[PDB]
């Protein structure tokens, strides 16, 4: 019977956190900071998608090319198998042509 | 599992509250219940055409039962209550026969007088003056 019997402990969310009250600051650091920095230089994450958006094939092509020289040995083989699969899916399968 | 269904209990009880009065496992097991709860709902709307059919067949069988008590057939009563412009329907005529049998004896007397006025006009062909209960009321 997949439904819980006691109602869960209450989710207390501080809306005036440090990360919440100062969220969004310096997203316009270009257009009113004399264009020294782009806002794409403000995003922190992986190296291969710091300022770049693609589908799943274009992400694995970019991950193999940018950071794939220093990837682990069976993480590179799991990535090469994924590009070998997503090539065949996007180019040979599907409804529209 | 990022978001899986947390409220599946209440979707089952939307169906299973209609099945509580069934037999077997149709009242408990959801897979067997939806094939009968759907089928119990289609029969609920297809029997709105059969209630109006089975009530009128009941009214005809209760007018035919009571018109035979005065020697009338059913087409000799309905056919000649129309000709006197007495536009009573089958529901009232079957509820006059049960609850007011003196008034129903007067409607069987009237539908048999108009019937005899229909025969006497038909055997006497050529121009004859009309019957007394055969005179129509015109509206303009």
């Amino acid at each position: 019977i997949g439904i819980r019997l006691t109602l869960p402990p209450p989710k207390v969310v501080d809306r005036w956190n440090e990360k919440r009250a100062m969220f969004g600051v310096y997203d316009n650091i270009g257009i009113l900071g004399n264009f020294e920095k782009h806002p794409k230089e403000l995003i922190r994450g992986p190296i291969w998608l710091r300022g770049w958006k693609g589908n799943e094939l274009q992400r694995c092509i970019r991950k193999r090319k940018m950071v794939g020289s220093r990837m682990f040995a069976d993480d590179l083989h799991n990535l090469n198998k994924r590009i070998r699969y997503l090539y065949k899916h996007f180019n040979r399968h599907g409804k529209f042509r | 599992l990022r978001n899986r269904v947390t409220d599946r209990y209440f979707r089952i009880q939307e169906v299973l509250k209609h099945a509580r009065h069934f037999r077997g496992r149709k009242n408990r097991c959801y897979r067997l219940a939806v094939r009968t709860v759907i089928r119990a709902f289609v029969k609920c709307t297809k029997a709105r055409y059969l209630k109006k059919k089975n009530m009128r067949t009941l009214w005809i069988n209760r007018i035919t039962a009571a018109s035979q008590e005065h020697g009338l057939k059913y087409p000799a009563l309905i056919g000649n209550l129309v000709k006197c412009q007495v536009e009573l329907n089958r529901k009232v005529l079957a509820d006059l026969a049960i609850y007011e049998p003196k008034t129903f004896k007067s409607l069987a007397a009237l539908a048999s007088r108009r019937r005899h006025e229909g025969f006497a006009a038909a055997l006497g062909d050529g121009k004859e003056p009309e019957g007394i209960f055969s005179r129509v009321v015109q509206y303009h």
Partner: protein
Amino acid sequence: TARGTPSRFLASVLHNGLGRYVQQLQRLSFSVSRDGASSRGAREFVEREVIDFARRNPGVVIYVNSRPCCVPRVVAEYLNGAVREESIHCKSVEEISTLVQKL
């Protein structure tokens, strides 16, 4: 369906039309949040038309409770002791004014 659901005969409460017509509502009870978008129309019903309503029938005694609820309810209690609690959650002002006149 009709074989699942109970049934009753067409009646009135105390022969409601014979001598006089007695209004059959006793109470309406509105829970209406002061801050809350779900009771946006319920706040406009109390502001505009609950005073025009409470004069159109002076037998109904109306209680606006105004407590912090997520779902605004209307609790219509009748003369034969029956309680019909309904929700006016996210309804416009024209949709509560017919829901209350139906009650």
